[PDB]
A paper describes a structure:
There has been a long quest for the structure of the poxvirus [name] holoenzyme since it has been shown that processive DNA synthesis by VACV E9 requires a cofactor composed of VACV [name] and the viral [name] (UNG), D4. The polymerase E9 is a member of the [name] family B possessing [name] and 3’-5’ proofreading exonuclease activities. E9 on its own was shown to be distributive under physiological conditions, adding only few nucleotides per binding event. We present the production in the baculovirus-insect cell system of the VACV [name] holoenzyme, which consists of the E9 polymerase in combination with its co-factor, the [name]-D4 heterodimer.
Here, we present a system for the production of the VACV E9-[name]-D4 holoenzyme and its 3.8 Å structure obtained by single particle cryo-EM. The parts of the complex where previous high-resolution structures were available were very well defined so that E9, the D4/A201-50 complex and the NMR structure of A20304-426 could be fitted into the density. The Alphafold 2 prediction of [name] could be fitted reliably into the electron density after adjustment of the relative orientation of the domains A201-50, middle domain and A20304-426 although for the final structure a model based on the very similar structure from MPXV has been used. The E9-D4 interface mainly involves two α-helices of D4, which contribute E32, V33, W36 and R39, respectively I135, Y136 and K139, while on E9, S177, F179, I180, L278 and L279 are involved. The side chains of D4 E32 and E9 S177, as well as D4 R39 and the main chain carbonyl of E9 L278 could be involved in hydrogen bonds (dotted lines). This interface belongs to one of the best-defined parts of the complex with a local resolution below 4 Å. The thumb domain of E9 is disordered in the cryo-EM structure, whereas it is stabilized in the crystal structure due to a contact with a neighboring molecule.
Residue numbers in the entry:
A (entry chain D): 1 to 218
B (entry chain A): 2 to 279, 285 to 426
C (entry chain E): -3 to 306, 313 to 829
């Protein structure tokens, strides 16, 4: 782990050595955007804006991309709810249970599966409003996503609309699966076969399939 | 995203798993699914191929070059023969191992394979060996049954099977030349046996052994032996008269055999086979010039002038032999599918088929000529390029290119009279 | 008050809400801008069996009659057992459906439903119609409910003109060293070019107080400037109104909201308009708010970019639905132009460029005048129009000098320029690269610099109206509306293979021909990479330039090449089967009905690929191409039958739009992602063009004029099938017997053929060319092929198709005249 000082909060950004070639441009962009970002309250807090940089990627293969942190209960861990109360992760647990048969469980963390890195495109959002803070974030978001897809085998995106043109912003072609967001109407995310397709494409890449059950906590 | 996409991915992955045991149809479908996947998901771990390396080494191991030990369980003994090796799969045809092509096979063997594969869903493939135009199904692998029930099924279906030997081993014995010879004799066949395939009940992998030693001898002559209608198998002898065995004329070219020289050969207890891995344009003409200009590459055989005629049309047509062009159309009407076969192909197709003409050589030679054509029939011809004459197949096929043009006009007027 | 039934369309667009509609922005003559709502739908045609087989009734359906269904697959054949083209005649029905009732088997799916709306209602895009009040129920103030467009657009009326409010605008922002960013680089100054319905060329150039001193602000207020600090305090008529960034952006928001008819910018939808968006959100909380006229939606400003491929390019746009075709100059001009650069300097250089006559000499300030007769009747008027604002002039195309004093009356200008005194006969005045370092002036920003750069920006944003009437973009856009059968909003927004589908659908609805495909395309393009090499570079004689009147657009009429008149493509792998098939085909399909065409073998193993086309019936693509060239000829005739200047606008635009659309068909035939795809069609069109080019070169090379008869190297025989013309390579020449001259073909690429004449007398070249055009058109060419002589190049120094210079002589001139000096590719 390495840490780097920015011109504003947190003034210290810890990251794993995989993220090393990103730090300079990340620092520049944040020093540019920080105060106007600070103009609103964020979920998670500004202090949490860089807990997704310490996670190593060399053992991460399937990147589950979330467009933004939640408007409330922002904790910096993508899709995460400390009490497992978020509807999105509830649907995620439902689909993974249906694939895996796990009838009884208490929670599901996407961050405790080897090969899977839950990820945020836009690092923050304003309280109760989605993607309003994307404007200050564009450069940082694109930077992080490109550095990530340098390594991750599979890119999965929750929400077809919010990920309409993620292909253009990312230069190197990569295994990309664009799926429903869990907030999709008529339970179309239940109909989503995303994870099985993900495992199949991993095997097509001669890669280890994801044991999504490891994310379950009983 | 869709479960249909999931099924497409599963099918493509299965095709990727079964790609050595593939054909042109399987390769085409695999390429199409790869295209769809790489367009949809912007990247796919597998790409397109065209050569298609075919191998069964996944079911076999490294060959035993020295005595080894056996002990547990029961063993099923199957022999390894000499000649061209082919593999027949589900919905696929015979393909030559290593250089997979679309070989031509009779209908009896084809129908027997079709029925023995339609009997049940659990057959990986059917393994066949061609030796002196004698089809021999050597083995067939599966994950549920054993090459005994399918062997009985094939025996009652009409195609030959090797006598499978079932033996039980209890003590620790060193499998050596003596026991190898004993089991070889236990099969009781006069065909060449190069190796032994022994399997254990439950093990999918099948390992083979081959005991041999080096030997060197003088080559006195290379001569063809009549083993079919217009089909002659080249062969060589020794000073003592020993018979050296050959798979294909391709092997002879690949071996760079020299007249009145010495060669290396790994000799078995019963037979001996010359060793390959000794260019092609040089050898294909040197061997013909040694044997004589009046020898043309008759497929995998060497033939004389091959003056052919009408009955050569009948034999490949598999119709009643006749020396009259009038009889060439009578039974065709009574033949429900012979007329279908003739009509479906082109005139040039039947022309090349009836005369044993290699494709590439003939096509190049023709593309080095000039022609006069009247009433859909060739009336004269002339060489446009004499550089093709460097290739012996070119000049030899030209020597009887009169045979080709005669049979070609005959075929065309045959089509015309079949209209009548 | 009341509604004026006489209206003209100036903009169409489609909605964005759950209930989507068509809102039309029309203009009455008296000065009204009226909106009409049209319930949008979805459009499909199915075979009548499918129509009867669907139980839940479609909302509305209309049959089109029994239209034959034509398969257009390409199927190679190694011999002559070529199957007849699949042809099923059946009745189709056109369904008007509100919801995406996707059907497994529905036909005509590759089009756009708005084109179908146009054709279904017969509503002409730019057409002025006498709308029906009984068919127009008022819903909003200015918006009306039109349920039945067919019975509403009942009576059409002749084209008249209208007052249109072309707003413009363009700004500048203080960058540091890198590109100006909204978060870090503030606005330097904006400058608008408001043009209301009155035609008042209003101006106001706002300047940022923030990056200047309050004392400097007071100085400027004392020097003429008016200062306001709010949105309510603004008056348009002043020029330098001063305010801070919040005030500037609030006023801009008040502006872009306005129900404008057009809005123009250079580069704007990518950098500048988005820049207002982001800077106004960063400082204030009010996104720029566009609204539908009927007050049922309210989108916010949206920047999105749409790609194209046919050089990798991207085009920005904004899907505001207020009513204003939020135009741009950069992308559209780059679509119309294949230029060395598209920097605004170069576009101005090659838009307004008038010749000068020296008036005053001495010191570094020289005064120049240009009257209407200085260079040409017309250059002076426009150039004086664009010399109201500009500051720098490129004299002699390299002397970039700043305007010191400009005097313009109506038809000409007098200008004092800071160019060194030099006794010269004349000069070329140009707007090339500008000589102001905005970066340096920003690095040393002050008051006087602020005012001068404010004038710079007002120039940069009033150039938009000048280019808007130079490139006739309003007229070309209204031409695109009724040509491509699109909304005016998207005349230059789509890609070619999409736009061509309008007239194609009209033609198909006429001939009742449907093009279907059930097989998958294959992966090979239409081009093989043909390279042309000139015979020589330096020419010691005159070169007669001969062109071709729409080479491919006419070829596709001659041979009837198409997808439904391509009966087969025959190949054979070897020479014997090659010749066998050759003679067999020459027997079976006899001329003149068919035509045997040689193409390139598509695969390495093939060597001869005969394409066989039937000219029995003029198909769809040939018929359309004949219609295009015929209508272009008709409009270019009507261009010199009328005197009203508005006519000399509309007819020029329609003629040029037809040229652009017809010329492109050869591409959309061979483009796998085009609705006109037939691989053999493109291959044989290229082949026929190649044969014609080689034929003409053989005709002219080796040709010598014998006394009074022209004796060619080769006879005048048709290259394609049996010919009844006098193929004699001796043709009577209408020149005196003393003429004896020889021709040596020197270059022809695709449609222009260079002809060398064995002399340097350009006048004799022109005379011989005048006779030669008639000679070619009456003896050598045939059927519908026609050419027209282009130019005479004496001292021609060419290196390739693009880098070449010469002294071009016009046919209207003689040896003792003013030749055209051409120099392209000079750096």
């Amino acid at each position: 782990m390495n840490s780097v000082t920015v011109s504003h909060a947190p003034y210290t950004i810890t990251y794993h050595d995989d993220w090393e070639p990103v730090m300079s441009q990340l620092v520049e962009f944040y020093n540019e955007v920080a105060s106007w970002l600070l103009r609103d309250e964020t979920s998670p807090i500004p202090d949490k804006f860089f807990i997704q940089l310490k996670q190593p990627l060399r053992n991460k293969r399937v990147c589950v991309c979330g467009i933004d942190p939640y408007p409330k209960d922002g904790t910096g861990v993508p899709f995460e709810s400390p009490n497992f109360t978020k509807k999105s992760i509830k649907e995620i647990a439902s689909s993974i249970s249906r694939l895996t048969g796990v009838i009884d469980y208490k929670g599901y963390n996407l961050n405790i599966i080897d090969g899977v890195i839950p990820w945020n495109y836009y690092l923050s959002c304003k309280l109760g409003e989605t993607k309003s803070h994307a404007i200050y974030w564009d450069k940082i978001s694109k930077l992080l996503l490109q550095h990530i897809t340098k390594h991750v085998s599979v890119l999965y995106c929750l929400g077809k609309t919010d990920f309409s043109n993620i292909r253009a912003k990312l230069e190197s072609p990569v295994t990309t699966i664009v799926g429903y967001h869990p907030a999709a109407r008529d339970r179309q995310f239940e109909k989503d076969r995303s994870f099985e397709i993900i495992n199949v494409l991993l095997e097509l890449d001669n890669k280890a399939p994801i044991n999504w059950a490891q994310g379950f906590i009983y | 995203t869709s479960s249909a996409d999931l099924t497409n991915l599963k099918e493509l992955l299965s095709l990727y798993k079964s790609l050595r045991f593939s054909d042109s149809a399987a390769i085409e479908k695999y390429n199409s699914l790869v295209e769809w996947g790489t367009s949809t998901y912007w990247k796919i771990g597998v790409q397109k191929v065209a050569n298609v390396e075919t191998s069964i080494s996944d079911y076999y191991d490294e060959v035993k070059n020295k005595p080894f030990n056996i002990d547990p369980g029961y063993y099923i003994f199957l022999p390894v023969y000499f000649g061209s090796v082919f593999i027949y799969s589900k919905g696929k045809n015979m393909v030559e191992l290593g250089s997979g092509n679309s070989f031509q096979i009779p209908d009896d063997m084809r129908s027997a394979c079709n029925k023995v594969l339609d009997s049940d869903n659990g057959i990986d493939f059917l393994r066949f060996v061609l030796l002196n135009n004698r089809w021999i199904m050597e083995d067939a692998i599966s994950k549920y049954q054993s090459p005994v029930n399918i062997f009985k099924l094939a025996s009652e279906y009409g195609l030959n099977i090797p006598k499978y030997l079932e033996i039980e081993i209890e003590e620790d014995t060193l499998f050596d030349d003596e026991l190898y010879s004993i089991i070889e004799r236990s099969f009781d066949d006069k065909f060449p046996k190069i190796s032994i395939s022994y399997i254990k009940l439950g093990e999918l992998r099948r390992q083979v052994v081959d005991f041999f030693k080096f030997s060197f001898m003088y080559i006195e002559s290379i001569k063809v032996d009549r083993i079919g209608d217009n089909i002659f198998i080249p062969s060589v002898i020794t000073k003592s008269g020993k018979k050296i065995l050959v798979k294909d004329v391709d092997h002879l070219i690949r071996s760079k055999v020299r007249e009145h020289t010495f060669v290396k050969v790994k000799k078995k207890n019963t037979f001996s086979i010359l060793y390959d891995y000794d260019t092609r344009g040089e050898v294909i003409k040197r061997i013909i010039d040694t044997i004589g200009r009046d020898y043309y590459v008759n497929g995998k055989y060497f033939s004389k002038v091959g003056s052919a005629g009408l009955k050569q049309l009948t034999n490949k047509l598999d119709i009643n032999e006749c020396a009259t062009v009038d009889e060439l159309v009578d039974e065709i009407n009574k033949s429900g599918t012979v007329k279908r076969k003739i009509k479906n192909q082109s005139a040039f197709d039947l022309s090349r088929e009836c005369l044993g003409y290699p494709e590439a050589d003939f096509i190049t030679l023709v593309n080095n000529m000039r022609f006069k054509i009247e009433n859909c029939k060739v009336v004269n011809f002339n060489i446009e390029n004499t550089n093709c004459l460097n290739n012996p197949s070119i000049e030899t096929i030209y020597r009887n290119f009169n045979q080709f043009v005669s049979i070609f006009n005959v075929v065309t007027d045959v089509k015309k009279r079949l209209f009548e | 008050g009341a509604m004026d039934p006489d209206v003209r369309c100036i903009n169409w667009f489609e909605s964005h809400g759950e209930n989507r509609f068509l809102y039309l922005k029309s203009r009455c003559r008296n000065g009204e801008t009226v909106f009409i709502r049209f319930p949008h739908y979805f459009y499909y045609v199915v075979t009548d069996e499918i129509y009867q087989s669907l139980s839940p009734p479609p909302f509305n359906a209309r049959p089109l009659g029994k239209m034959r269904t034509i398969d257009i697959d390409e199927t190679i054949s190694y011999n002559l057992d070529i199957k007849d083209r699949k042809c099923s005649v059946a009745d189709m029905w056109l369904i008007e459906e509100p919801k995406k009732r996707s059907i497994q088997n529905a036909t005509m799916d590759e089009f756009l439903n708005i084109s179908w709306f146009y054709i279904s209602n017969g509503i002409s895009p730019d057409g002025c119609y006498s709308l029906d009040e009984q068919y127009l129920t008022k819903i909003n103030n200015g918006c009306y409910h039109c349920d039945d467009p067919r019975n509403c657009f009942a009576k059409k009326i002749p084209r008249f003109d209208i007052p249109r409010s072309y707003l413009f605008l363009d700004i500048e922002c203080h960058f540091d060293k890198k590109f100006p960013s909204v978060f870090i680089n503030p606005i330097s100054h904006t400058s608008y070019c408001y043009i209301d319905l009155s035609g008042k060329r209003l101006l106001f150039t706002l300047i940022n107080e923030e990056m200047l001193t309050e004392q400097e602000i007071q100085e400027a207020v004392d020097r003429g400037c008016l200062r306001i600090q709010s949105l309510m305090e603004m008056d348009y008529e002043r020029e330098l109104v001063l305010c801070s960034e919040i005030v500037l952006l609030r006023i801009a928001k008040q502006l872009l909201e306005l129900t404008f008819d057009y809005v123009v910018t250079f580069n704007g939808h990518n950098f500048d308009l988005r820049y207002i968006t982001n800077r106004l959100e960063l400082l204030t909380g009010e996104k720029i708010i566009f609204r539908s006229p009927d007050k049922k939606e309210a989108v916010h400003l949206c920047i999105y970019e749409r790609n194209q491929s046919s050089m990798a390019n991207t085009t920005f746009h904004v899907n505001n639905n207020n009513g204003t075709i939020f135009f741009d100059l950069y992308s559209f001009i780059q679509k119309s132009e294949k230029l060395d650069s598209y920097k605004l300097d170069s576009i101005s250089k090659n838009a307004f460029s008038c010749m000068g006559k020296v008036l005053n000499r001495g010191v570094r300030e020289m005064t120049f005048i240009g009257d209407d007769t200085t260079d040409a009747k017309g250059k002076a008027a426009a150039f004086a129009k664009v010399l109201t604002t500009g500051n720098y002039v490129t004299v002699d195309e390299d002397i970039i000098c700043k305007v010191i004093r400009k005097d313009i009356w109506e038809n000409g200008f007098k200008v004092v320029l800071l160019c060194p005194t030099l006794p010269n006969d004349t000069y070329k005045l140009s707007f090339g690269k500008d000589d102001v370092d905005l970066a340096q002036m920003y690095k040393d920003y002050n008051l006087n610099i602020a005012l001068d750069m404010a004038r710079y920006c007002i120039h940069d944003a009033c150039l938009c109206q000048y280019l808007w009437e130079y490139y006739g973009v309003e007229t070309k856009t209204d031409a695109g509306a009724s040509t491509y059968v699109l909304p005016q909003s998207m005349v230059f927004e789509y890609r070619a293979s999409t736009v061509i589908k309008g007239p194609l659908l009209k033609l198909l609805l006429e001939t009742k021909t449907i093009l279907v495909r059930s097989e998958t395309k294959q992966k090979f393009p239409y081009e093989g990479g043909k390279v042309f090499a000139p015979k020589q570079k330096m020419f010691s004689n005159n070169v007669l330039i001969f062109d071709y009147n729409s080479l491919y657009p006419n070829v596709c009429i001659f041979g009837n090449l198409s997808p439904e008149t391509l009966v087969g493509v025959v190949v054979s792998t070897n020479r014997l089967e090659e010749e066998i098939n050759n003679q067999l085909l020459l027997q079976k399909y006899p001329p003149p009905r068919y035509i045997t065409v040689h193409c390139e073998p598509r695969l390495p193993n093939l060597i001869s690929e005969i394409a066989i086309f039937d000219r029995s019936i003029e198909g769809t693509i040939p018929r359309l191409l004949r219609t295009f060239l015929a209508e272009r000829a008709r409009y270019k005739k009507m261009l010199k039958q009328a005197t009203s200047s508005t006519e000399k606008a509309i007819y020029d635009s329609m003629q040029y739009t037809y040229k652009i659309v017809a010329n492109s068909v050869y591409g959309l035939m061979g483009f796998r992602n085009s609705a006109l795809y037939s691989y053999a069609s493109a291959k044989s069109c290229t082949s026929i063009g190649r044969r014609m080019i080689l034929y003409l070169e053989s005709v002219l090379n080796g040709a010598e004029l014998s006394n009074g008869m022209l004796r060619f190297a080769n006879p005048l025989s048709n290259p394609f099938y049996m010919d009844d013309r006098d193929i004699n390579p001796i043709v009577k020449t209408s020149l005196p017997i003393d003429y004896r001259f020889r021709f040596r073909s020197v270059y022809g690429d695709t449609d222009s053929v260079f002809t060398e004449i064995d002399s340097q007398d350009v006048d004799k070249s022109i005379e011989i060319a005048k006779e030669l055009e008639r000679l070619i058109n009456n003896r050598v060419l045939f059927n519908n092929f026609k050419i027209e002589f282009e130019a005479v190049y004496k001292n021609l120094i060419m290196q390739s198709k693009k880098k070449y210079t010469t002294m071009k002589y016009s046919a209207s001139s003689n040896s003792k005249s003013v030749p055209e000096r051409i120099n392209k590719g000079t750096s």
